[PDB]
Amino acid sequence: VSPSYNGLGLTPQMGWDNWNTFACDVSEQLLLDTADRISDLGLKDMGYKYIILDDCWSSGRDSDGFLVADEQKFPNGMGHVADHLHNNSFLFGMYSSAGEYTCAGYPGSLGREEEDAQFFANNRVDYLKYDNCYNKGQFGTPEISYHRYKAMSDALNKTGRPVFYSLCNWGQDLTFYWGSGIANSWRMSGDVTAEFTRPDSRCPCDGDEYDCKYAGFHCSIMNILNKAAPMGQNAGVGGWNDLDNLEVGVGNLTDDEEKAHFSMWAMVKSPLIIGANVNNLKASSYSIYSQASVIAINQDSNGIPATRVWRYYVSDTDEYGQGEIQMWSGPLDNGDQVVALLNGGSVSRPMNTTLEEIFFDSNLGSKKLTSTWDIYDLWANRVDNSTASAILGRNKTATGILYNATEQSYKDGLSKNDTRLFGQKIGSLSPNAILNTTVPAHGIAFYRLRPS
Amino acid sequence: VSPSYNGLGLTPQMGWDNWNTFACDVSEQLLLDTADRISDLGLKDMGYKYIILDDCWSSGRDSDGFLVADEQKFPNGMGHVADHLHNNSFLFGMYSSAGEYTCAGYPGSLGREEEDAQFFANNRVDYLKYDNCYNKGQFGTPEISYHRYKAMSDALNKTGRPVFYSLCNWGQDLTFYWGSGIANSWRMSGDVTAEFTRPDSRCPCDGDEYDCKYAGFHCSIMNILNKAAPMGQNAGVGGWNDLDNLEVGVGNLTDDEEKAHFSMWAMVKSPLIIGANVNNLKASSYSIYSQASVIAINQDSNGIPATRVWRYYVSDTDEYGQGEIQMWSGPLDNGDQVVALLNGGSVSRPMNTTLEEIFFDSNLGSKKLTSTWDIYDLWANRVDNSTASAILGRNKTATGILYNATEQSYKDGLSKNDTRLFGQKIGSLSPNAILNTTVPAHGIAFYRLRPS
Amino acid sequence: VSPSYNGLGLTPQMGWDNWNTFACDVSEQLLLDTADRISDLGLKDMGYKYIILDDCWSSGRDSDGFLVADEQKFPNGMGHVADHLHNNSFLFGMYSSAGEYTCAGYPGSLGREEEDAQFFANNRVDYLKYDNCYNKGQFGTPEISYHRYKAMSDALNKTGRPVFYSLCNWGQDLTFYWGSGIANSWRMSGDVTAEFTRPDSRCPCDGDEYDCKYAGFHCSIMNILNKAAPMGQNAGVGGWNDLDNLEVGVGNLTDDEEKAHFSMWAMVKSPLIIGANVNNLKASSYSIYSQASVIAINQDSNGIPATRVWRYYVSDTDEYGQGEIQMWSGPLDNGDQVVALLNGGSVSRPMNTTLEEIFFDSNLGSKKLTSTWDIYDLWANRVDNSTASAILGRNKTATGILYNATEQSYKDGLSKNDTRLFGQKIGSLSPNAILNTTVPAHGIAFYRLRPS
Amino acid sequence: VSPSYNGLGLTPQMGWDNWNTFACDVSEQLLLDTADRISDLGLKDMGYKYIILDDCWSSGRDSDGFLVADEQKFPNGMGHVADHLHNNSFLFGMYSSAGEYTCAGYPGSLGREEEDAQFFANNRVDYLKYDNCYNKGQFGTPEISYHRYKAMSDALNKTGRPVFYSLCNWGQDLTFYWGSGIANSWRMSGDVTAEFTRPDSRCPCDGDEYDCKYAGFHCSIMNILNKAAPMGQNAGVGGWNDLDNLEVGVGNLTDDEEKAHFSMWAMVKSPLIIGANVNNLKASSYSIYSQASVIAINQDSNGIPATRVWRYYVSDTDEYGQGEIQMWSGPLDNGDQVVALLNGGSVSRPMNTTLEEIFFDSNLGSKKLTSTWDIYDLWANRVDNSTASAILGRNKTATGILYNATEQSYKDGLSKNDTRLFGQKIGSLSPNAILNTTVPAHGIAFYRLRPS
Numbered sequence A, B, C, D: 001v002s003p004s005y006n007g008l009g010l011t012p013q014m015g016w017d018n019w020n021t022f023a024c025d026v027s028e029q030l031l032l033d034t035a036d037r038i039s040d041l042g043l044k045d046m047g048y049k050y051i052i053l054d055d056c057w058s059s060g061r062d063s064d065g066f067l068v069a070d071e072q073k074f075p076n077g078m079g080h081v082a083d084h085l086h087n088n089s090f091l092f093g094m095y096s097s098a099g100e101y102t103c104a105g106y107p108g109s110l111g112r113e114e115e116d117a118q119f120f121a122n123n124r125v126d127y128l129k130y131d132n133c134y135n136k137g138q139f140g141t142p143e144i145s146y147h148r149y150k151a152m153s154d155a156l157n158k159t160g161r162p163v164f165y166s167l168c169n170w171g172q173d174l175t176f177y178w179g180s181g182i183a184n185s186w187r188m189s190g191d192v193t194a195e196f197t198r199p200d201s202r203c204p205c206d207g208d209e210y211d212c213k214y215a216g217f218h219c220s221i222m223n224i225l226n227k228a229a230p231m232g233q234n235a236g237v238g239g240w241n242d243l244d245n246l247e248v249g250v251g252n253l254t255d256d257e258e259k260a261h262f263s264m265w266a267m268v269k270s271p272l273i274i275g276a277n278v279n280n281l282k283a284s285s286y287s288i289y290s291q292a293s294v295i296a297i298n299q300d301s302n303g304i305p306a307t308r309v310w311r312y313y314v315s316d317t318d319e320y321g322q323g324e325i326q327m328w329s330g331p332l333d334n335g336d337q338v339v340a341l342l343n344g345g346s347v348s349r350p351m352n353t354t355l356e357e358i359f360f361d362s363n364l365g366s367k368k369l370t371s372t373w374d375i376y377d378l379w380a381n382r383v384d385n386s387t388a389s390a391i392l393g394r395n396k397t398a399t400g401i402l403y404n405a406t407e408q409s410y411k412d413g414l415s416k417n418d419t420r421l422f423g424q425k426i427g428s429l430s431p432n433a434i435l436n437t438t439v440p441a442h443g444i445a446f447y448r449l450r451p452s
């Protein structure tokens, strides 16, 4: 454990990034309309407060060497976008790359950290996503990558404006080891894609290669989760592993895959940044994003990512030859435990565990193993497709339906035993008894255990 | 994406290198006779404009430390060879090594970059192949290799003469990551050899070891293609992965192996440098080199290397225990798609795919997956063995037979719907239907899909 | 071989560390009560002389930048704890980390080595455990880790007070290669845990990955032993591989697992630091710790770690899929040999070897292979559960029961043929004959061979 | 190819090292008696001219920092040993380590290169074996190891006395890549041992791990040969891979294993340094060492190590689970070819090949594949056990029996068609015909092919 380096990231950040769905075709108008939508839908007040502008926003540099925002896309400048966002109680993110160019070929910040940090401060930016394209040979060992990333960290600090600092170097040179002292989160892999399991030749490292020499992209949800599994021990208050933006409401993932994806990103204390087009967001994907109970896990005070207890390969493999089952378990701040039974097989199956596996670090005869625990389904009381479609078509308000974390923080709601945050009691687990369920294909059983 | 670093390599380079067939036994006369031949055969005007002189050309250094060309082999000097080439509208390549010696033991350029760059400029050289033999311990991490290669890059730039810069360090220290900002292409492996699949003990890294510590040589065509597969995402306008000179018309590859080799080098946007002895070039190998349709893929404006969609091992293995099948697919600038079904098995087989696999990045219900696509065989209208033998024996001209890209660029020919560049329509592919063919052993089915 | 760098560590150190059982909840009173206990139980005079205070002891830094011990936990300061310990003939250990923070987030010593070394000297500290948390990017290659650790080594030396120097960097960057010239021992892995075999996702490197990029923790006893196996050749007088504190009397290991664990740590010349709560130490675990015969192996003058002769996987696997059998053998200073037959299978089994396997480096026809050897059981005459429970409840003294190594060193006791140190003769082994026994599940047969 | 860096090592060196059989128990008298023996036995005049004194020769340093030879072991100093050796036409080798200590703990040369080089020059030393123990963190990347080794290289050069420079860093940090420009040979692995195949836990890298992080020792003959296999392409005139001293006449290898070992070290152009106790050398081992025909392969002018053509695992495995078969083939300077069929299986087997496999780099229809080749057995006319025992007991002279390479160099003897150097013609190999033999367990068929 260590204090946060800058006082931010006390829990993993939440928000939205305009990329996964809009590429270089961004404007003040897109960004603010979408911002309005996220507020209207009650997602802002759930915690999704960072509106992150991604690549392709700039037009080059002025005569003083200073970044210039594209005047066609942003006729009032960035500072003006910031103010609008702040006036609707949003936080504002921007993007650059620790290299000569950004990934899409725009001006990068390598060797221009001071001016560029100053640009972000002058434009009242609250958050920086900091990429790793065209890094000019400045990678290959922990030391050289750390110093390249420390250079922007220090330059942001020098501006005296608080900036949440988000590393995007894909776990290159063992980022989990060095990120915390200079940054609030770090991408620990190549880009995610809307595929639950699919191996891809553009993502050459498999789920077991957490230390990868070619991060790539188009990595599956499970490839990324698998790489992240040993890394939980290097995350914590102030500095989080980042498993990349959520693909919920993007492409063609099933409701089960989307739930597993969301539940798992939450449990390992990843940032929850929406990759969906929230103006073309479908009903089922919306109610996944807005599941307060699950966000409560992510936003646990003094957050500890959960541990993979076990992993087995099954014969029920999918069209891509993939098929495994996993159990994860982790402690929660109020003494509760989160448990996940994850069915990455291609068929529905019975899944099972015991108290000895759940409290994998408790001794025989300890109180945890000797006591009874009520089981709470974290997926109960999810917003039905009807209500969600209503809200999405502006026929019903989100107010009084969605949990309002701005009004009541996750910590305080948890203290007040707030039903919206614990799911639904479905049973109890005694010593020497098994916990059984049937878990859908590419799905999840996701529980919170509380003492009886 | 990033701009070209020097304005060259807007498409992968094409030409000829005198090595694969002539070793140290080079002269002004060999080089110019061969040059004449490449022009006469219509290959120059197809795009094969770089005549690259390789190792063993020098005799040492003069009293000022300056490279001295062998006076027996080049009695008029290199500048004189350059002028002759330029007067027949050719471009001129030379060779050195980023080390103390070249691979064949001639003077290398390490620490002598300024003088040596100046030598190339003074002799009006247009292209440099820059090797990695005897590098004096200056390798082992990305940073140290990058700086060694940047040293020649900067020295070439300082001369003010445009020089296409071709790295030859065999992918050592992850060249795909750092090449583009200092160079126009980079060898991503040990030397190729005229063997389609054959594992070799002098090439210890298998096709899956893209990050290799001992690049070696005598690597098979498939070993090299396999290593190159994840790397396409780091290639693009201005900076290309180099899979080494073509072995078409060299050794004893079959017509099928030669077609697969050529089609695959094209599709991943490798340079197409002829390794053949063009004065002892056989009929079938000639018509492979001169297939305009396939070169059109390589010379696509705003080039994107294709992606390996899938790869499976088969039981139909060859004399060396090798046998796999692959599907590759990639977008083309005008909206078309290139598709390859590659049969590395030892027996002819039926091969098949669908629109969902071809447009592997398109969503269900998108227009691409919802529309019909005409299939064009990129191997149709290939110059028959008769016509090719005629041309080769100086009994028929190439004029009016071969596509003349000097007269009409590949881009413009593609715009004009020029039949010579699209192959032959053979069918159409509808939603929910399969695309089937029979693909020869160690062969390829190579298509261009256009919207109906 | 090399001299000890500082004159210490002539044999592996022994003692106790307050962590495995007490975490941050430490005080002068805990530490001294426990110290009293270790003396009373006769363990001190067996060799367990280092009382090591671990993380969480400090409260920050004073106005001069100097470490400040927590005044609530240590109202008299550390120097006062030291004096008490020294007055009962104990040695005193403290802890820091070669990073910005300690693992539990207290002040670390990186860049503060001189002051911090001086703090330890001023407080009369005899031993330093030096961790690797929050090392600020200063790892990744042997050179950078060596210099970071050399910095504290030199600063300790500069104080002129002898300090036993114990590296805790988990074998990162091949510590076995560079530790000896700057240190007396080095952790060669992630943290141990009270699990004999259990794979854990927080310890991603398996037993075969001695060169690990993510040491982690919760590694099994066998995972750690397996990683240590090639490393014995880089240990010796003055500088020892450290396989982490003993889990004997911690969690729920069986008596067999505890014996194997203890016997194996001894044989490879690891430090024997008690991880147990000695005030809540059970009878069986106590008599394992106090087995003089086995400690005699660890404390062999001119110590050579034993060699793994063979390793095989068995079908008798445990609940975690683990199951292997091993034979280890090593020379002893007086010409004797230590032999271990280790049953990591889940079932009791017959185990067997010969003289040719025991003297794996002796030639055919040599005297060793030609002679007869008496077999001594190193586990005979172990303190029975009754006597141990008596001593533990303060109903019987340890005096005259336990070997007193303060009175008679292990070397001198070995010379005097002292029965307490050789175990019990159980037979003899002749040329061309097999040595057979039945070895319990997760257990060990542990012998000393002496010439007939 | 590159010139020799210092003009030496035009062929691999030959000689004797006093270690494998005498450890630290060395003297002027041992060394000179043994020297006398090597001359008397005719081995000197065969090429075994370097008498290499190994570790444990020094007693520390004098008041000027200068190495001091042990006055008990060398009462006249080293220079006096040198002169004696030179007066019997021998060359003289000494030893140090690129570290703080030598492997046996004597003074090392790290940071003391100038004085120590000067010591070797002052004592008229002709050869240096330069180890890698206690290198103080100065390893881990090619660059850092190269510079450490270059430091002694330059210091030797500065003395102006020719010194054959032999690196002993066990292939650490890819020595094959950088050795040639600073040295005449380089150990490419951990120490050999008298075991043909035996895996050992002190040698964790298997035969496929040529790039090893823990070289270790007690590596088998086949483990070392396997690691060396890709490396032949980086050896050549002036700079050789070193597979460690010969174990012929050491331990208990069979006559077949000894022949295979010797034949294979020769074929890959390793140094041939005798590890045997030549005063306790058995008859069969002697006639292996003195096989002129095989040494002729090693001492080929313009030496090219042979290539492994193929390798297969067999079911006929030994007591250690090992069993493979290999074919090697390489060109010789006079146009001949060396072929080896190696039976690492546990049983005698038929072995076979063709001309297409022998001339693995020749095209179909080339002259090599189209011609007939006489097969010569390189093991014929070996000195029978009787004659060898006679010579060894000083009952018969070696003169007129052994080839005298001092009188007639291997090159010149090869030119003169000297029967002693080509073995015995046993047949001929035609196109489209197979070459068959039966090869003993752990043995070799070792041929020279000459054009008919």
Ligand SMILES: *[C@@H]1O[C@H](CO)[C@@H](O)[C@H](O[C@@H]2O[C@H](CO)[C@@H](O)[C@H](O)[C@H]2NC(C)=O)[C@H]1NC(C)=O
Residues within 6 Å of the ligand: A249, A250, A251, A252, A280, B363, B364, B365
């Ligand atoms: C995934 O495939 C579904 C069919 O199951 C397909 O409908 C989605 O594309 C979306 O289709 C929507 C149907 O309501 C259409 O209204 C919506 O505009 C469309 N989204 C896009 C980008 O065209 C697929 N999912 C997504 C979001 O791509």
Ligand SMILES: OC[C@H]1O[C@H](OC[C@H]2O[C@@H](O)[C@H](O)[C@@H](O)[C@@H]2O)[C@H](O)[C@@H](O)[C@H]1O
Residues within 6 Å of the ligand: A001, A233, A234, C054, C055, C095, C102, C103, C104, C131, C133, C168, C190, C191, C215, C216, C217
């Ligand atoms: O309390 C310090 C402790 O550190 C070691 O354990 C390291 C362990 O600490 C946690 O911070 C991380 O989550 C985990 O990844 C690390 O491995 C060390 O082994 C021990 O001696 C002790 O100093």
Ligand SMILES: OC[C@H]1O[C@H](OC[C@H]2O[C@@H](O)[C@H](O)[C@@H](O)[C@@H]2O)[C@H](O)[C@@H](O)[C@H]1O
Residues within 6 Å of the ligand: A054, A055, A095, A102, A103, A104, A131, A133, A168, A190, A191, A215, A216, A217, B001, B233, B234
């Ligand atoms: O638009 C920037 C984008 O970069 C990341 O994706 C990196 C991706 O970009 C392409 O240039 C390459 O072809 C591919 O190899 C790279 O992996 C990053 O993950 C994302 O957050 C975003 O900044």
Ligand SMILES: OC[C@H]1O[C@H](OC[C@H]2O[C@@H](O)[C@H](O)[C@@H](O)[C@@H]2O)[C@H](O)[C@@H](O)[C@H]1O
Residues within 6 Å of the ligand: C001, C233, C234, D054, D055, D095, D102, D103, D104, D131, D133, D168, D190, D191, D215, D216, D217
């Ligand atoms: O006597 C020096 C000797 O060193 C080599 O053997 C290295 C060997 O030495 C031991 O100190 C270690 O336990 C073991 O790990 C090392 O591998 C070298 O091969 C040899 O030539 C010789 O100089």
Ligand SMILES: OC[C@H]1O[C@H](OC[C@H]2O[C@@H](O)[C@H](O)[C@@H](O)[C@@H]2O)[C@H](O)[C@@H](O)[C@H]1O
Residues within 6 Å of the ligand: B054, B055, B095, B102, B103, B104, B131, B133, B168, B190, B191, B215, B216, B217, D001, D233, D234
């Ligand atoms: O003639 C130069 C040549 O070098 C390359 O081939 C490298 C090859 O050369 C030999 O010296 C070695 O034995 C072998 O190990 C090396 O791989 C390069 O691929 C080629 O373009 C050309 O410049």
Ligand SMILES: *[C@@H]1O[C@H](CO)[C@@H](O)[C@H](O)[C@H]1NC(C)=O
Residues within 6 Å of the ligand: A005, A006, A007, A156, A157, A158, A159, A160, A161, A162, A163
């Ligand atoms: C800058 O750094 C110091 C810690 O070094 C910290 O106290 C402060 O909050 C930082 N300021 C900003 C704006 O990040």
Ligand SMILES: *[C@@H]1O[C@H](CO)[C@@H](O)[C@H](O)[C@H]1NC(C)=O
Residues within 6 Å of the ligand: A254, A255, A282, A283, A284, A385
């Ligand atoms: C809501 O919709 C999703 C897909 O859009 C579907 O999978 C799910 O079953 C629906 N929920 C219910 C309870 O029907």
Ligand SMILES: *[C@@H]1O[C@H](CO)[C@@H](O)[C@H](O)[C@H]1NC(C)=O
Residues within 6 Å of the ligand: B005, B006, B007, B156, B157, B158, B159, B160, B161, B162, B163
């Ligand atoms: C040299 O460098 C600059 C870019 O840094 C570029 O504009 C110019 O074209 C280069 N000149 C040559 C001849 O490569």
Ligand SMILES: *[C@@H]1O[C@H](CO)[C@@H](O)[C@H](O)[C@H]1NC(C)=O
Residues within 6 Å of the ligand: B254, B255, B282, B283, B284, B385
């Ligand atoms: C042309 O020749 C090649 C080999 O030289 C042969 O494989 C091929 O079948 C020939 N083409 C046709 C259509 O016969």
Ligand SMILES: *[C@@H]1O[C@H](CO)[C@@H](O)[C@H](O)[C@H]1NC(C)=O
Residues within 6 Å of the ligand: C005, C006, C007, C156, C157, C158, C159, C160, C161, C162, C163
């Ligand atoms: C400090 O270093 C020297 C060796 O360099 C050693 O003789 C001395 O004992 C050391 N002192 C202490 C207290 O460690």
Ligand SMILES: *[C@@H]1O[C@H](CO)[C@@H](O)[C@H](O)[C@H]1NC(C)=O
Residues within 6 Å of the ligand: C254, C255, C282, C283, C284, C385
């Ligand atoms: C002593 O106790 C341990 C467990 O506490 C038990 O396994 C062992 O069998 C006992 N010893 C004897 C000889 O009964």
Ligand SMILES: *[C@@H]1O[C@H](CO)[C@@H](O)[C@H](O)[C@H]1NC(C)=O
Residues within 6 Å of the ligand: D005, D006, D007, D156, D157, D158, D159, D160, D161, D162, D163
């Ligand atoms: C020293 O170096 C030069 C080459 O740099 C070489 O010509 C000379 O022979 C060397 N001298 C010795 C004695 O090694």
Ligand SMILES: *[C@@H]1O[C@H](CO)[C@@H](O)[C@H](O)[C@H]1NC(C)=O
Residues within 6 Å of the ligand: D254, D255, D282, D283, D284, D385
């Ligand atoms: C010579 O002796 C060796 C072993 O010392 C034996 O293996 C070999 O067969 C003998 N040679 C002959 C031809 O008998």
Ligand code: NA
Residues within 6 Å of the ligand: A080, A084
């Ligand atoms: Na406005």
Ligand code: NA
Residues within 6 Å of the ligand: B080, B084
């Ligand atoms: Na001319």
Ligand code: NA
Residues within 6 Å of the ligand: C080, C084
């Ligand atoms: Na006191």
